Design a protein around this ligand. Sequence first.
Ligand SMILES: [Zn+2]
Ligand SMILES: [Zn+2]
Ligand SMILES: [Zn+2]
Ligand SMILES: [Zn+2]
Ligand SMILES: [Zn+2]
Ligand SMILES: [Zn+2]
Ligand SMILES: [Zn+2]
Ligand SMILES: [Zn+2]
Lengths: 80, 80, 80, 80
Amino acid sequence: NGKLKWKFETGGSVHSSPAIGQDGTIYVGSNDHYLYAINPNGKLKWKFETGGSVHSSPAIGQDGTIYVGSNDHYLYAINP
Amino acid sequence: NGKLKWKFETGGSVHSSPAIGQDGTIYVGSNDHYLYAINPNGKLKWKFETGGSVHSSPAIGQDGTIYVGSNDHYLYAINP
Amino acid sequence: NGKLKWKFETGGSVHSSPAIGQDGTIYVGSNDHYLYAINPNGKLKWKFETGGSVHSSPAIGQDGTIYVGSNDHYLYAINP
Amino acid sequence: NGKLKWKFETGGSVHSSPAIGQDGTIYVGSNDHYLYAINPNGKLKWKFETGGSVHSSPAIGQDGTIYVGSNDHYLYAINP
Ligand SMILES: [Zn+2]
Ligand SMILES: [Zn+2]
Ligand SMILES: [Zn+2]
Ligand SMILES: [Zn+2]
Ligand SMILES: [Zn+2]
Ligand SMILES: [Zn+2]
Ligand SMILES: [Zn+2]
Ligand SMILES: [Zn+2]
């Protein structure tokens, strides 16, 4: 209905587009260099530090693996 | 067939890529800082103001929740 | 196997990410301001001129409608 | 669980967002001008050189064809 459910603060601009896991987990990169995994309730699940801004948008594999590029030149594969 | 169905004017460049809800609603960010929810007929459903340009492309959860990053550093979860 | 099938020349950088229709049609924006509809064989189906660069990536609705933002501030809904 | 599975080094910033094939292959562009095809185990499958940075995010057709734009103005269709 367009009402805020919650907002989660990262350390930089969130240019990355979120991806949704099988359990509802939301994955998204931030310009603060981290890939974020956020629970559907808004609490952080984990965050993974890459070497540069994560402008790339994550994709989820058939086994749950999360893949995302970084401006540090790497394609990352992160376990769930 | 490549003919215009309609066009909806936001207040800034629409860099964000649209997402489609279960009922056909189209969600998209604008550089004018808003997340837009547009009905399949072209009429605005609602718009949600974040603190910065919405370059991020929205994702839709299993329960309809719309998630999108903003250049204000936040990942937003918006109720339908 | 990583061999070129074909390449289709637009008038500018293709920053937009392609979307695939029910019949295999590939839709993508170009910085030349057009939304392109390309047949799976590489021949143009149609192209639609917006008012600015199409950095936004198209989405396809349940009825085939293609939606894409433009840097001209508009969200476009294009008939198939 | 947020632990690194692997990271694959390209020659430039990975702004492109990855796409996942039917067999788990991960496709992604790099600013080094290549489209990469990476096996789920982290070993390169192939890489395809376009004429400019691949900021566009790949899409996969019903027959496995991978489509991606390049800043060289072209939309590419690459065989699997
Ligand atoms: Zn900032
Ligand atoms: Zn930095
Ligand atoms: Zn403008
Ligand atoms: Zn602003
Ligand atoms: Zn050029
Ligand atoms: Zn222009
Ligand atoms: Zn670099
Ligand atoms: Zn270059």
